[PDB]
Structure formats: C-alpha cells, structure tokens
Amino acid sequence: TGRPEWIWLALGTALMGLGTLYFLVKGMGVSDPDAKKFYAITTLVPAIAFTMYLSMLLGYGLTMVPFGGEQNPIYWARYADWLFTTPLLLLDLALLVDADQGTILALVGADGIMIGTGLVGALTKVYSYRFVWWAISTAAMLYILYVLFFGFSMRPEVASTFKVLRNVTVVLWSAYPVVWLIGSEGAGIVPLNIETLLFMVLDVSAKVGFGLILLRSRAIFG
Amino acid sequence: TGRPEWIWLALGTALMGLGTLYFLVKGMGVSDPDAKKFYAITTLVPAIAFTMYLSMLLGYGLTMVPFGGEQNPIYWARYADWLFTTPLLLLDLALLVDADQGTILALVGADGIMIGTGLVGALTKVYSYRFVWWAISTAAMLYILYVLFFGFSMRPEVASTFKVLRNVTVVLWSAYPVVWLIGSEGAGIVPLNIETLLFMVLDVSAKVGFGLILLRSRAIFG
Amino acid sequence: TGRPEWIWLALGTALMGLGTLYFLVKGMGVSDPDAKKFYAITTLVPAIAFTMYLSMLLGYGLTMVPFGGEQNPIYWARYADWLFTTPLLLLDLALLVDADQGTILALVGADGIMIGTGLVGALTKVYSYRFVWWAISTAAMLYILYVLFFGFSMRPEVASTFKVLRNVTVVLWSAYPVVWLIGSEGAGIVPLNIETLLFMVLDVSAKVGFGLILLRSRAIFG
Ligand SMILES: *C/C=C(C)/C=C/C=C(C)/C=C/C1=C(C)CCCC1(C)C
Numbered sequence: 191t192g193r194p195e196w197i198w199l200a201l202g203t204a205l206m207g208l209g210t211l212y213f214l215v216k217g218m219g220v221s222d223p224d225a226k227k228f229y230a231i232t233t234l235v236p237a238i239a240f241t242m243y244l245s246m247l248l249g250y251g252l253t254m255v256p257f258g259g260e261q262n263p264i265y266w267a268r269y270a271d272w273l274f275t276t277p278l279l280l281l282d283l284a285l286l287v288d289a290d291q292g293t294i295l296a297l298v299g300a301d302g303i304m305i306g307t308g309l310v311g312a313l314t315k316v317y318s319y320r321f322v323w324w325a326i327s328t329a330a331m332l333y334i335l336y337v338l339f340f341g342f343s344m345r346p347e348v349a350s351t352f353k354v355l356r357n358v359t360v361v362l363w364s365a366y367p368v369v370w371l372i373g374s375e376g377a378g379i380v381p382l383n384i385e386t387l388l389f390m391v392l393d394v395s396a397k398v399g400f401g402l403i404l405l406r407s408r409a410i411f412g
Numbered sequence: 413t414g415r416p417e418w419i420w421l422a423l424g425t426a427l428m429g430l431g432t433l434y435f436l437v438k439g440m441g442v443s444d445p446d447a448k449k450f451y452a453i454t455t456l457v458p459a460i461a462f463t464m465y466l467s468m469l470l471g472y473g474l475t476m477v478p479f480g481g482e483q484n485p486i487y488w489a490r491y492a493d494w495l496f497t498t499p500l501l502l503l504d505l506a507l508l509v510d511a512d513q514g515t516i517l518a519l520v521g522a523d524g525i526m527i528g529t530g531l532v533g534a535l536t537k538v539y540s541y542r543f544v545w546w547a548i549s550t551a552a553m554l555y556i557l558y559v560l561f562f563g564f565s566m567r568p569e570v571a572s573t574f575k576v577l578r579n580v581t582v583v584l585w586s587a588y589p590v591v592w593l594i595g596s597e598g599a600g601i602v603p604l605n606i607e608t609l610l611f612m613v614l615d616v617s618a619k620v621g622f623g624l625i626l627l628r629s630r631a632i633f634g
Numbered sequence: 635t636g637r638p639e640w641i642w643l644a645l646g647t648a649l650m651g652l653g654t655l656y657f658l659v660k661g662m663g664v665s666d667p668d669a670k671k672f673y674a675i676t677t678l679v680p681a682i683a684f685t686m687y688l689s690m691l692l693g694y695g696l697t698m699v700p701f702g703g704e705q706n707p708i709y710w711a712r713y714a715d716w717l718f719t720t721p722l723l724l725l726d727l728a729l730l731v732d733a734d735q736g737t738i739l740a741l742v743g744a745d746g747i748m749i750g751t752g753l754v755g756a757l758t759k760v761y762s763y764r765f766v767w768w769a770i771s772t773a774a775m776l777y778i779l780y781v782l783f784f785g786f787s788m789r790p791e792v793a794s795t796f797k798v799l800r801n802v803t804v805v806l807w808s809a810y811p812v813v814w815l816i817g818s819e820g821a822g823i824v825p826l827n828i829e830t831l832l833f834m835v836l837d838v839s840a841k842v843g844f845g846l847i848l849l850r851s852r853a854i855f856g
Pocket residue numbers: 272275276279304305307308309311323324325327328329331363364366367370393396397
C-alpha cells in the first residue's frame with residue numbers, strides 16, 4: 191500500500207506465521223505433559239502476533255490520535271498483542287523455574303499494568319501526559335526485570351536454559367520503552383516506518399527466537 | 413421494536429434466562445467439589461449469554477459497519493458473549509476427560525483466536541478482507557475440533573458423556589462459520605432476521621441443551 | 635482543573651499510590667509461598683486502582699453519554715478498574731478459607747457479570763434501560779454476598795480474619811449500587827463531585843483498608 195512501513199508489517203506477518211506453523215509441527219509428537227505446556231504457550235505467542243501483525247498490515251489495527259498539533263498514526267493493535275503474549279512469555283519463564291503462584295500472579299499483573307498503561311499512553315491526546323503513562327509502564331517493566339533476577343536448586347537442564355532466556359528477555363524487552371519514546375508515540379524523533387522495523391525485529395526475536403531457544407532445549411521435559 | 417429480528421433476540425433472552433435459573437436451582441444441593449465445578453461453568457454460560465442477548469434486544473450490542481456499499485448492522489455483542497462462553501464450554505469438556513493443562517491452554521487460546529479474529533472480521537470495512545479473517549477463524553475452529561478428537565482409560569461414566577457432548581459440539585459449532593458466511597456479516601445471502609434465528613437456535617442448543625445433557629449425567633461427580 | 639471533583643480524584647490517586655508502595659515494601663521480606671500469594675493479590679489491587687484514578691484525574695477515563703436530555707459525564711475507567719480488582723479481592727477471601735475451585739469460578743464469574751453489566755448500564759443511551767442493567771448487576775452482587783455467607787473447620791487464625799474481611803466486604807460493596815443509583819449514572823439526585831467523593835472513600839477503604847487488615851494478620855501464613 192501507501193504506507194511505507196507496509197513492508198515491515200508484511201514481513202512480520204510472514205515470520206510470525208511461519209514461526210507458528212514451525213512450532214505447531216514440532217510439537218506434533220509430544221506427549222510429555224510438561225513439554226506440552228511449553229509447546230502450547232510457545233506456539234500461541236506468535237499465532238496471536240500473526241493475527242495482530244496482519245491486522246496492522248490490512249489497516250484494521252491503526253487509528254489516528256491528535257496531539258502536539260498533528261494527527262498521529264498509532265498502531266493500537268500492538269497492545270492487543272502484547273496484552274496476551276507478554277504474560278505468556280513470562281509464564282514460560284515461570285514454569286521453567288517452578289515459580290510460586292504468588293510470584294506468577296505478581297508477574298502477570300505487573301505485565302498487565304505495563305501494557306495497559308502503555309495503551310493509555312498511546313491513545314492520550316495531551317502530549318505531556320503521554321510520557322507520564324510511559325514512565326508508569328517503564329516502572330512495571332523494571333519490577334518485572336527485578337523479579338526475574340531477584341524473585342527466584344533447579345536441575346541444571348533448567349538453570350542454563352532459564353538463564354539464557356532470561357538474558358534475552360531483559361535485553362530485548364528493555365528496548366521497547368526506548369523505541370516508543372523516540373518513535374511516533376512519543377517524541378517523534380525516529381519516523382514510523384523505522385519504528386515499525388525496530389518493533390518487527392524485536393518482536394520476531396522475542397517470540398520466535400525465544401521460542402526456538404526454549405523448544406530446542408531438554409529443559410522443557412519432565 | 414422496528415427490527416424484525418427482535419423476536420428472536422427476545423426469545424433468546426428468555427431461554428437463556430430460564431436455563432440459567434434452572435441450572436442455578438439444580439446445583440443448589442451440590443457439595444461434591446468436582447460436580448460444583450461443572451455446575452459453576454455450566455450455569456455461567458447461559459447467564460453471560462442472557463446478558464448479551466438482552467443487550468442486543470435493547471440495541472446496545474448493535475453497531476453499523478459500512479462495507480460493500482451499505483451501512484451494515486452488526487451485532488458485536490455476540491463476540492463479547494462467545495469470548496467467554498466458548499472457552500467455558502471447552503473447559504467442561506476438558507475437565508470431563510481430565511485433560512493436561514497444556515491441552516487446556518491450547519484449547520482456550522485457539523478459542524480466543526477464533527472469536528477475536530471473528531470479531532475483527534465482523535468490524536472490518538474492506539469487504540474482501542472480512543473473509544480473510546473468517547478463514548483464519550475457521551482454521552482455529554478446525555484446530556479445536558482436531559484436538560477434541562485426536563488430542564486426548566476414562567471411567568465409562570465419563571467416556572459416554574464426553575462422546576455425546578463432543579458430538580454435539582462439533583456439529584453445532586461447525587454451523588456458526590456457515591451462518592456467518594452467508595449472513596449479514598459475510599455474503600449477505602440470508603437476511604439478518606433469519607440469521608438471528610439461526611444463531612438463536614444454535615446458541616440455545618450449544619449452551620442450554622449441552623448443559624442439560626452434561627448436568628443430568630453422573631459423569632460430573634467424583 | 636475545571637472539574638470540581640478533581641480534588642477527590644487527586645486524593646484517590648495519591649492514597650492508592652501510597653497504599654501500593656506501602657504493601658510493596660511490607661511484602662519485601664516474605665518467603666512463605668502462601669503469604670506471597672496474599673501479598674501479590676493485595677498489592678496489585680491498589681496499583682491497578684492507582685492507574686485508573688490517574689486516568690480519571692487526567693481526563694482519559696471520562697466520556698460523555700447522552701441520555702434523559704443531557705450530555706452526561708461518565709467515568710468509565712472505574713469499570714476497567716473493578717473488572718480486575720473486584721475478582722482479586724474475592725480471591726483473597728477465597729484463598730483464606732481454602733475455597734473449592736468451583737466456588738471460586740462462581741465468584742469470579744458472577745463478579746464479571748456484575749461489573750460488565752454495570753458498564754453497559756453506565757454507557758446505555760436509553761434512560762429507563764440503564765436501570766434494568768443496574769438491577770441485573772445488583773442481582774449478581776447479591777449472589778456473591780450469598781455465597782460469601784452460605785457458600786462455605788478453618789484454623790481460627792483464618793476464621794477470625796475471614797469474618798472481619800467478609801463483614802467489611804458486604805457493608806462497603808453494598809453501598810456502590812446505592813451511590814450509582816442516586817448519582818450521575820442513575821437518577822441524578824447527588825451531584826458528580828459528591829459521588830466521586832463517595833466512590834473515593836469506598837474504594838480506598840475496600841482496597842487499602844481491607845488490605846491493611848488482611849496483611850497485618852497471621853492468617854495469611856501457612
Ligand atoms: C512479543 C512482544 C514483546 C516481548 C513486547 C514487550 C513490550 C514491552 C516490554 C513494552 C514496554 C513498554 C514500556 C515499558 C513503556 C511504554 C510503552 C511500552 C508498552 C512499549
């Protein structure tokens with residue numbers, strides 16, 4: 191179409207779609223109850239992202255938000271995505287280490303707060319206040335990071351995989367607040383097509399890359 | 413009112429309302445923890461549908477979607493309904509056979525995808541793309557059907573009831589994609605008042621009929 | 635700002651924000667898995683309410699609903715709040731007494747119905763029908779009250795705390811339907827600024843007061 195970012199939304203759609211089919215096939219032969227859990231969570235993450243990448247591609251997941259003078263194009267569908275896929279990615283981490291349910295409920299709820307405040311900030315018409323919501327969301331993000339590092343005798347199959355996925359998680363998740371801030375939702379420093387490319391690379395890596403490291407590990411079997 | 417389908421929405425409201433009160437009363441005397449589970453899930457399905465049938469009756473759950481030339485009346489409230497009642501109906505099936513949590517998470521998430529893509533398709537303003545969302549939703553539907561047949565030593569109380577409810581589920585659920593397709597959301601082949609009658613018969617049977625077969629069975633007790 | 639209720643929204647924001655930080659700190663040193671559960675649920679309730687009080691403060695969580703002649707200001711964000719915090723408050727009660735999952739699913743679903751019908755009623759443009767939704771919502775409220783009293787050998791640490799929190803819950807929750815009814819959502823008897831003060835006192839007490847009684851009790855430890 192007439193949106194230069196179209197290409198990145200198309201590529202994202204395609205990579206999430208093929209990741210989903212790859213993990214669907216791979217989990218084909220699994221009967222270990224624990225492994226099945228990791229396969230369900232992990233296949234669903236890019237299947238959901240596939241649908242929201244498609245909706246942005248076709249224009250459904252775009253709206254116009256007036257602020258600081260202009261009519262700003264905001265991809266809201268990303269927050270419908272993340273609202274479900276980010277807790278699921280935290281659940282993969284949580285089950286891996288056999289987390290207490292109280293830590294799991296802290297993680298999923300802090301994550302909800304993160305995305306939902308992210309979404310408010312994305313849709314807020316008073317420019318200055320958009321960054322008060324960014325800050326609140328970043329604080330929930332940093333609570334989550336804190337818990338993944340200080341919130342938790344695992345078998346070494348689990349600890350090595352956990353540590354890797356944990357490192358991947360903090361490095362990539364921590365880049366989203368930065369892209370938002372300098373992108374079209376925030377200061378408007380980086381154009382939307384570049385932003386959309388940044389978010390596509392993070393999203394494919396955080397979902398499909400993350401899942402490839404997880405699902406190739408023996409950590410997931412009981 | 414001035415909507416010919418009003419009658420079917422009124423009848424649906426009434427039948428869901430009486431189903432809810434019937435199951436509420438029936439579960440009155442239950443103390444078996446397992447049976448209580450089946451009674452909670454099963455009573456809630458038509459209580460939620462009661463509220464969304466009422467909202468369509470009163471006009472709240474209707475919006476206008478422009479596409480292929482016209483201003484199309486779309487009952488969106490059906491998707492608020494299904495978003496919660498269809499996973500609950502799958503949970504009744506799942507608990508019955510003592511499903512692994514990984515199979516339960518695959519079912520509920522595939523179901524979310526099904527309804528949420530159904531909803532996108534219902535609200536999409538580009539006529540051709542409405543059927544790309546229909547197709548994606550039908551694929552999640554067929555994954556669910558596949559799992560109910562190939563995804564799963566139960567006591568014979570469970571297997572006989574499970575098989576029946578399973579058969580009821582595939583026959584009725586599989587008719588929704590067809591009604592949508594030829595109805596006002598799709599090709600516009602069947603008028604909205606006839607569509608609304610079709611959806612009312614399916615919905616009462618899939619919820620109240622399904623629950624009557626379930627809740628009259630000894631399969632639900634530990 | 636130019637809204638007289640601004641002050642109560644500001645005070646509510648501040649009290650929910652300090653409650654959240656207080657409970658965050660207090661739960662700092664907890665390792666008992668059961669206590670951690672109570673701390674997660676209980677800290678999250680005012681953290682979520684903090685964000686929705688802020689959004690009403692800044693104007694995001696306000697919309698205009700035309701009915702009975704006028705353009706009515708409706709704070710919708712309260713229902714985004716309650717949709718999650720009221721089930722969490724019921725979960726604190728439920729875990730305390732070691733409730734059956736079927737009773738927990740009845741509680742959370744009745745609560746969803748309560749808030750979601752509350753929200754429909756708040757946004758309904760036909761004045762008379764707003765009170766049909768109020769009535770349906772009040773009925774779910776009374777089902778919840780019934781279950782907390784008749785739905786359930788606990789150790790006396792639990793029974794004393796449970797009884798207190800239970801009493802707090804019915805007295806304060808039962809006042810919300812009254813405030814709505816005579817406030818701006820309903821008959822328009824009490825002005826919006828007074829209503830907003832009423833809701834702020836109930837909300838701080840039902841969340842922060844409730845949590846102080848809970849989290850100071852030994853009932854929460856295994
Ligand atoms: C699959 C997608 C992933 C892992 C996305 C993660 C997104 C975040 C961690 C987003 C965080 C944000 C904040 C901390 C600041 C406000 C804006 C957000 C939502 C982009």
